[PDB]
Amino acid sequence: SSIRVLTTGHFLPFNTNLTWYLTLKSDNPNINFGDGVYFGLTEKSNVFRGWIFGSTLDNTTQSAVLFNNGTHIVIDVCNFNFCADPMFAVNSGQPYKTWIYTSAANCTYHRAHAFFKHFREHLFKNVDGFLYVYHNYEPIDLNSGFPSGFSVLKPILKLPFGLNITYVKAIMTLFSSDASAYFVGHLKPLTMLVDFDENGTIIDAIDCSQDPLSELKCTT
Amino acid sequence: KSFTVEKGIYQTSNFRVTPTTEVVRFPNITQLCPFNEVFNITSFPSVYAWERMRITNCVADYSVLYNSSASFSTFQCYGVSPTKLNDLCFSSVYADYFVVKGDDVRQIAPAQTGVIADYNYKLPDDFTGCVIAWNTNSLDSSNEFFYRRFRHGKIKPYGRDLSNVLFNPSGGTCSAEGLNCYKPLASYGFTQSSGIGFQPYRVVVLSFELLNAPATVCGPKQSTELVKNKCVNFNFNGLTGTGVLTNSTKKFQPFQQFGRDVSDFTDSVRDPKTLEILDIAPCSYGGVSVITPGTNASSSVAVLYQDVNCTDVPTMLHADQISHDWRVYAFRNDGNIFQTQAGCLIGAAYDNSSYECDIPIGAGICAKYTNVGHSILAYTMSLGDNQDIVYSNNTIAIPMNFSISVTTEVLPVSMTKTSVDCNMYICGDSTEC
Amino acid sequence: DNQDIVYSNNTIAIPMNFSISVTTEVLPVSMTKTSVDCNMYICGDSTECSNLLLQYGSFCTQLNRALAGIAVEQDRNTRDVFAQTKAMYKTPSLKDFGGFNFSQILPDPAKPSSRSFIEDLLYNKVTLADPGFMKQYGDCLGGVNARDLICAQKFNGLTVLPPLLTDEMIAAYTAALISGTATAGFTFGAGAALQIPFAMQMAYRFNGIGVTQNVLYENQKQIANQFNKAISQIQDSLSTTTTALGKLQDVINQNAIALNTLVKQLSSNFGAISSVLNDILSRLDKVEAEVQIDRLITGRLQSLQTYVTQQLIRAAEIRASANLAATKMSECVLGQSKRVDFCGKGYHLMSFPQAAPHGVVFLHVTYVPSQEQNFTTAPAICHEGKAHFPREGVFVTNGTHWFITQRNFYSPQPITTDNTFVSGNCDVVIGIVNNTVYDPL
Amino acid sequence: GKLQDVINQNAIALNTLVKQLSSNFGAISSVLNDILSRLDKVEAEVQIDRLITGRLQSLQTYVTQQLIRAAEIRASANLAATKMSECVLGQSKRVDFCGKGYHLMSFPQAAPHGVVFLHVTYVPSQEQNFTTAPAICHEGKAHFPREGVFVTNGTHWFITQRNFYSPQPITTDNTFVSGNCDVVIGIVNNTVYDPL
Amino acid sequence: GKLQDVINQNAIALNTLVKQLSSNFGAISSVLNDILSRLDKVEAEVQID
Ligand SMILES: *[C@@H]1O[C@H](CO)[C@@H](O[C@@H]2O[C@H](CO)[C@@H](O[C@@H]3O[C@H](CO)[C@@H](O)[C@H](O[C@H]4O[C@H](CO)[C@@H](O)[C@H](O)[C@@H]4O)[C@@H]3O)[C@H](O)[C@H]2NC(C)=O)[C@H](O)[C@H]1NC(C)=O
Ligand SMILES: *[C@@H]1O[C@H](CO)[C@@H](O[C@@H]2O[C@H](CO)[C@@H](O)[C@H](O)[C@H]2NC(C)=O)[C@H](O)[C@H]1NC(C)=O
Ligand SMILES: *[C@@H]1O[C@H](CO)[C@@H](O[C@@H]2O[C@H](CO)[C@@H](O)[C@H](O)[C@H]2NC(C)=O)[C@H](O)[C@H]1NC(C)=O
Ligand SMILES: CCCCC/C=C\C/C=C/CCCCCCCC(=O)O
Ligand SMILES: *[C@@H]1O[C@H](CO)[C@@H](O)[C@H](O)[C@H]1NC(C)=O
Ligand SMILES: *[C@@H]1O[C@H](CO)[C@@H](O)[C@H](O)[C@H]1NC(C)=O
Ligand SMILES: *[C@@H]1O[C@H](CO)[C@@H](O)[C@H](O)[C@H]1NC(C)=O
Ligand SMILES: *[C@@H]1O[C@H](CO)[C@@H](O)[C@H](O)[C@H]1NC(C)=O
Ligand SMILES: *[C@@H]1O[C@H](CO)[C@@H](O)[C@H](O)[C@H]1NC(C)=O
Ligand SMILES: *[C@@H]1O[C@H](CO)[C@@H](O)[C@H](O)[C@H]1NC(C)=O
Ligand SMILES: *[C@@H]1O[C@H](CO)[C@@H](O)[C@H](O)[C@H]1NC(C)=O
Ligand SMILES: *[C@@H]1O[C@H](CO)[C@@H](O)[C@H](O)[C@H]1NC(C)=O
Ligand SMILES: *[C@@H]1O[C@H](CO)[C@@H](O)[C@H](O)[C@H]1NC(C)=O
Ligand SMILES: *[C@@H]1O[C@H](CO)[C@@H](O)[C@H](O)[C@H]1NC(C)=O
Ligand SMILES: *[C@@H]1O[C@H](CO)[C@@H](O)[C@H](O)[C@H]1NC(C)=O
C-alpha cells in the first residue's frame, strides 16, 4: 500500500499489436504459445467459450480442454481425438448437443464446477508444470473495436499438470435455428514500474523501454 | 567500555530485555494427514508415467510413521532443515510418486543428468522440498515397470509424456519397426536376486511453498489464547517475531496473507483460529540519554527521555519487568521529575536562576553539580547581562583614557604523517595469503 | 548586454545624485544533528543478531564518535556566529531615529511572537520536515498515523537531537545586536558602548566613504525616505517570492532524503535468502543461519558507514559556510568595511542581521551614485612659472571657470591656495592649462 | 585544546586500526594460521578472502577519515598563513580580525603542530558625556567640522577626536563652509576664532 | 602545476576504476560468461552477488 516498486517478468508490452479474429455469420487457428498469451473477447450472446491446449492435437499426445457447458465448467486432461471443428450447438435458445471431441481414453485429470455489452480478459502462463489463468471483467460500450483504457487482472485458478503446451485453439458456437470477436496478444520479458494506493489496488503502471519519457520515469 | 566515565551527557543503547508471554496461533485443523495412503498404497506407477496428488487440510505429524514398519534409505530435504518441519506451515503441497531402478535414486535431485533426469523426471534448479526413497524388492519384483530410453530432446523441469510413437534416430517417424526404428520404452529387468542396484525402489517427492500464501497444512503445535496491547513474541503460521498487536482497518483479498512495508518488515497480518486483520509494531522506541558529573566526584546520574510525556511516563517505562534501580527512576516521589522542551528529565532539580552553561542538555537547558548536600541541578541558560541603555539625541560619550591589551590566538597548522603497509596488516609471515 | 564605451582622454564623468539600496545575502549556519543505534537497525528483537554483532561493535563505537563530533561542531557553529555581543541591550521604546524607521526589524511591545516582522516572514517560507520534536509512542500507534516517514524512521533506531539554542534566543541575540548598533554605533563591537546620535553616526559613516558630513545635513529627509522605501520594497520582494531562500530548504531536503534512503535500504538481501531475520531462523539450522546473518550484518554496517561519511563531508562544508558568516557578521555589522563587494554592491554603510532557520540573513545598506554628466578635465593648473596639483579630487571646468571637486559627488569649490600643492614648473606635464587661483587677501 | 585534540584523534584512530584485527568477518577464526592448520586448500581459500576484504575495508575507512581531517587542517593552515601575512607584517583595519580593539602589533610563537599569535591592541576607556552639535554658524553661513565632533565645555565650544579627548579651539581650518544655517536641524549659535 | 595536477588526478582516477574489473572478489572468475557457462543457477547466483 502506497509504494512505488518495479518488477521484472513476462508482460504484454504497451501499445503493441493484437490480432483481430471474427466469427462470421455467412475461425480458430492454431495460435502459438510462447511465454504466454493474452485473450480479450467482446461478446453479447455468450458465443465464445472454451480453449484447447496441447502440442499435436491428436491421440498420440495428451491435450487439455477448459470450457463452459452453460451449466458446468468441465476441465479434463485426456488423450483426445479432436475432429475438424470443436463446436457448440444450441436450439431455440437452449443447449441440446455439444460437439467438441469424438474419443478420449488414458485420461489422467478431471474437474467440474457449477455455474457488445461485456468485455472479458484472460491471460495464460505456463511455468514449472503449472497453468496460470488470470481473469478480469468490465462492461463496455455498444459498439467499439477494442476497449481502450487500463485494467488489472486477478488470478482465479492454478492447474497442476505437466504438459507440453505449444499451441492453443478456440471453441465457437453456432445457432442451429450473433457475431463476435476476440483479440490475441503475446507476452514478452520486460521491466515494469507500478504504484499502489492506500488500499491494496494497482492504479497505474509504466512500461519502460517504450519511449524516452517512460524510460526517464523508470530511471527516476 | 570503561570503568570511569567523565563529565558530560552521553547516549545509551537499551541493555534491558522484555521476557513477556508467548502467543501461538495456528489454523483449526484436526484431521491427520494421509501418510498411510501414500506410503502403503501397494500400487506405484512407472517413472515415465508418474502421478501427482494434492495435500490440503492436513496436520503434518510424521512421528506416526514411527508406529509403522517403513524404513527409508534416502531422506534428503532441500531449502529447509529437517529439524524445523514440526514448526512450519505450508501453503501448497504436492507429492509425486513412482518406481525407479535403484541405481537412479541419485538422479532424483536438482541439477542432475542421466536417463531419468533427461527423459523421464526432472526437477528445477531452485527446488524446495524433500526426497524420500526405500527398497521394495519383496513387492515390486514380479510386476512390469518401464522407462523412456529414446527421445529427441530433454523434458521440462516439471513435465511428463506418455506418447508411444516409434523412434527414428535421425528424422521423423519410421512407422515400421525394424532397422533404425526402435520403441522408446525400455523395460526394467526385475528378477529375484539380481543385485542391489537393480532392485526396485519406491520414490516420493514433496514440494512446499513457504511463507508466501495462506497455509492449509501445518505441524503439530498447540495454540495459545490471543492477547493485545502488549509486546509479545508470537507465532502466526510459522512466522515468528516480537511486538505489540493492534486492530487495523485494512481489508484485502483472500489470496493475500501477509503485509510488507518499504523496509520489507511484516506490518500487517491476518489471523488463524478466527478471521481478523492485525497490525504488528516493535516495542523498542524512544531515545534515552544519561547525565553524569564524572565518576570520582559522585556515582549518581540523571536520565532524560527525548520522546515521552512526563506525566504519563511509565506506560513506555514499565517498571514491572525491570529492576528496582529502574523503578526508582521511572517515578519519583518528590519534585525531582519534570518536563523540559527536550523531553522528561528525572533525577535533577529545577532552578529559576540562570547561569552559564556547564553540561548542555538541549533546548536552552543546562545542568551542573552544585552544593545547593550535592545534587544535580538543572537551569535555563543565560545569554548575557542586560544594559537598559537610553537614547539621547544631543549627548555623545567620549573616552578620556586608554589601555594596551595583549590577546592570545592559537591555530593548528599540520598533523602527523602516517605510512601504511598493505601486507603485514592484512597478512604477515604467511605466504599463502 | 553590450555597452560600447569609448575612450575620450580629455573628459571625465561625475555623478550628480545618489541613492540608497538595501540588499540580501543568505548563508547556512548549522545542520541537523542525528544519532544512530546499531541495534534496531542491523538487528532488533533478535538476540542471535546481537550476539553476532558483539564482534562488530567497535565499528559502531567509531560511527557514534563521528556523529557526536558532528553534533558538537553543529552546536558550536551557531554560538560562533550569533553570540557576538557582550551585553543584552534592551530594545528602545522609540523605533524612530531621525526619520529612520526601525520598527520592521525589531520586536514590538505588543508581544505577538517576541521576534521581528521580517524575521517572522523569514519563517513560514521554508518548511521543516518534522513539525516539532515530540513524538510519543501513542502517536505512532493511533491508527491514523500509519505509514509515516518519521515514525518508521524512529523504529529503526535513527533519532534527531534538538539544537541547544532555541529560536527565541537567536531572535533575542539579533534584537540585542540591532538595538546596540542603533543607539551606540559600531563602537560597542570593540570595547564598551559609546552613545551617539543617529544622524551624527550616519555622518561618520558617510565620512568613511569619501563624502563630506554636510550632504546628509541638507538631504536628511530624502535619505530617510529612501531608506524606508527600500525597507518596504525588500519586505514586499521577500513576501512575493518563494525561490530566494533555497540554501536552507536544500539543507533540510538533503537531510530528509539521506535519512529516508538509510531507512529504505533495509530491504536488500546481500546474498542471503531473505532480508528478514525471522524467516531465515525459522527454516534453517544454526550453521547456515550464522553465515547468512553475517552477510546481512556486513551489508548493513557498510550502508551505515556510507551515510556517516556523507554526513562528515556535509558538516565540513557547513563549517566553512559558518566561518564565512561569522567573519561577515564581525566585519560588517560591528563595523564598516572597505573591501569591495564584501557586503553589498555599492559603498557599505550599515548591515542588520535577521535570524533564519539553520542560517542567517543580512540586510546590507549601500551607497550608490547616479545621474552622470561629462566634464572636461585637466591634470594640473599653473598661473606663475610654478605648477599646482590637486591635493584631492580632480580639476573640472564650467566652460568659463575652473573648480576642484570630489570624484564621487559634484561639489564645485574655488581653487584657493588651500586644497592644492605646488611642485615643479609647468613645462613637463602634458595637458597643463593656464588659469588663475584665488588668494585670500 | 586544539593541538592536544589534533594529537589525540591521530593517536585514537591508529589505536582503533589495531583493535579491528580481531574480527572473524564470517570466518571460523581471526588467526590466519589456525585456518590453514585445520582445513584443506579449498574451504580455506574461501575463508581467507572474506578476512582480506574486511581488513581492506577497515583500511579504507581510516584513509577516508584521514583525507577529511587533512582537508580541515589545510583550511586552518590557510587561515593561519593569511593571518601571519596580514597582521605580523602589517597593520589591519578589519574589525576583530587580530585582537579585540584597534590593532597595533602581533608576534608569532611556535607550538607543536600549531602557531600562537600574541595580538597587541589599543582599547579606550574612562567614558564621559558631552553635549554635542552637528554644526556651528555665526554669520548666515554654516560651518561643518572636517573631522571629529563639536562638543561643548558647558560655556565654550571645542572640536576633538572621537577616540580620544583633546579639545582644540574652533578656527578657520578643521572646518568647511557650505550653505546657510536655516535648514540644518540642531544649529547652534556660537563664535569661531579667525587668525587675523 | 595545479591545473595539470587536477587534470592528471581526474585521468588517474578513471584509469584506476577500469583496472579494478579484473578482481575475482572470492569468486571463480572475474568474467560473468564462464561462471554461467560452467555452473548451475544456485552457485552462480552466489558468485555473481
Ligand atoms: C513439444 O512439442 C513440440 C511440437 O512437437 C516439440 O517441438 C518439436 O521438436 C522437435 C525435436 O527438436 C523438432 O523436430 C526437429 O525438426 C527438424 C527437422 O524437421 C530438425 O531440426 C531436427 O532433426 C534433428 O533430429 C535429431 C534430434 O536429436 C538429430 O539427430 C538430428 O541431427 C537433427 O538435429 C528435429 O527433428 C520439431 O520441429 C519441433 N516442432 C515444432 C512445431 O516446433 C517440442 O520439442 C516439445 N517440447 C518438449 C519440451 O519436449
Ligand atoms: C499404532 O499402530 C497400532 C497397530 O499397529 C494401533 O493400534 C490399533 O489401534 C486401533 C485404534 O484404536 C485399535 O482399534 C486396534 O485394535 C489397535 N491394534 C491393531 C493391531 O490394529 C495404534 O493405535 C497406532 N497408534 C499408536 C499411537 O500407538
Ligand atoms: C514604520 O513603518 C510602518 C509600516 O509601514 C508604519 O506603519 C505602521 O505599521 C504598523 C504595523 O504593525 C501599524 O501597527 C501602525 O499603526 C502603522 N502606523 C501608521 C501611522 O499607519 C509606521 O508608521 C512606521 N513608523 C514610524 C515611526 O513612522
Ligand atoms: C571416455 C571419456 C571421453 C571424454 C568424455 C568427457 C566428457 C563428457 C562427459 C562425461 C561424463 C561421462 C559419462 C556419464 C554418463 C552418465 C550415465 C548415468 O548417469 O547413468
Ligand atoms: C488415433 O487416431 C488415428 C487417426 O485418426 C486413428 O486412425 C486411430 O484409430 C486412433 N486411435 C484410437 C485408439 O482412437
Ligand atoms: C490406455 O488405454 C488403452 C485403451 O483403453 C488401454 O488398453 C491401456 O491399458 C491404457 N494404458 C494405460 C497406461 O492407462
Ligand atoms: C479504499 O477503501 C475504502 C474503504 O473500503 C474505500 O472507501 C475507498 O474508496 C478506497 N479508495 C480510496 C482511494 O481511498
Ligand atoms: C501396510 O499396512 C499393512 C496392514 O496393516 C501392514 O501389515 C504393513 O506393515 C503396512 N506397511 C507399511 C510399510 O507400513
Ligand atoms: C520557580 O518559578 C515558578 C514560576 O513562577 C514557580 O512556580 C516555582 O515555584 C518557582 N520555584 C522556586 C523554587 O522558587
Ligand atoms: C589613565 O590611566 C592611568 C593608569 O591607571 C592613570 O595613571 C592615569 O592617571 C589616567 N589618566 C587620566 C587622564 O585619567
Ligand atoms: C536626486 O534624486 C531625488 C529622488 O528622485 C530627486 O528628488 C532630487 O531632485 C535629485 N537631485 C538632483 C540634484 O537632481
Ligand atoms: C558657469 O556657467 C554658466 C552657464 O552654464 C554661467 O551662467 C555662470 O556664470 C558660470 N559660472 C559660475 C561660477 O556659475
Ligand atoms: C596658457 O595656455 C593657453 C592654452 O594654450 C594659452 O592660450 C595661453 O596664452 C597661455 N598663457 C600664457 C601666459 O602663456
Ligand atoms: C570651561 O568652562 C569653565 C567654567 O567656566 C572654565 O573655567 C574653563 O576655562 C573652560 N575651558 C576649559 C578648557 O576647561
Ligand atoms: C543665534 O541663534 C539663536 C538660536 O536660533 C537665535 O535665537 C538668535 O537670534 C541668533 N542670533 C543672531 C544674532 O542671529
PDB file of C-alpha atoms and ligand atoms in Angstrom, chain C residues 398-401 403, ligand 12:
ATOM      1  CA  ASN C 398      32.319  75.173 -16.158  1.00  0.00           C
ATOM      2  CA  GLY C 399      33.387  76.147 -19.672  1.00  0.00           C
ATOM      3  CA  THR C 400      34.491  79.576 -18.426  1.00  0.00           C
ATOM      4  CA  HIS C 401      35.965  78.892 -14.969  1.00  0.00           C
ATOM      5  CA  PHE C 403      36.973  74.353  -9.983  1.00  0.00           C
TER       6      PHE C 403
HETATM    7  C1  LIG F  12      29.086  78.815 -15.211  1.00  0.00           C
HETATM    8  O1  LIG F  12      28.447  78.706 -16.465  1.00  0.00           O
HETATM    9  C2  LIG F  12      27.147  79.271 -16.508  1.00  0.00           C
HETATM   10  C3  LIG F  12      26.490  78.892 -17.817  1.00  0.00           C
HETATM   11  O2  LIG F  12      26.419  77.490 -17.924  1.00  0.00           O
HETATM   12  C4  LIG F  12      27.251  80.785 -16.278  1.00  0.00           C
HETATM   13  O3  LIG F  12      25.983  81.397 -16.223  1.00  0.00           O
HETATM   14  C5  LIG F  12      27.940  81.048 -14.941  1.00  0.00           C
HETATM   15  O4  LIG F  12      28.199  82.412 -14.740  1.00  0.00           O
HETATM   16  C6  LIG F  12      29.274  80.302 -14.864  1.00  0.00           C
HETATM   17  N1  LIG F  12      29.941  80.490 -13.593  1.00  0.00           N
HETATM   18  C7  LIG F  12      29.539  80.117 -12.358  1.00  0.00           C
HETATM   19  C8  LIG F  12      30.506  80.484 -11.259  1.00  0.00           C
HETATM   20  O5  LIG F  12      28.495  79.534 -12.094  1.00  0.00           O
END
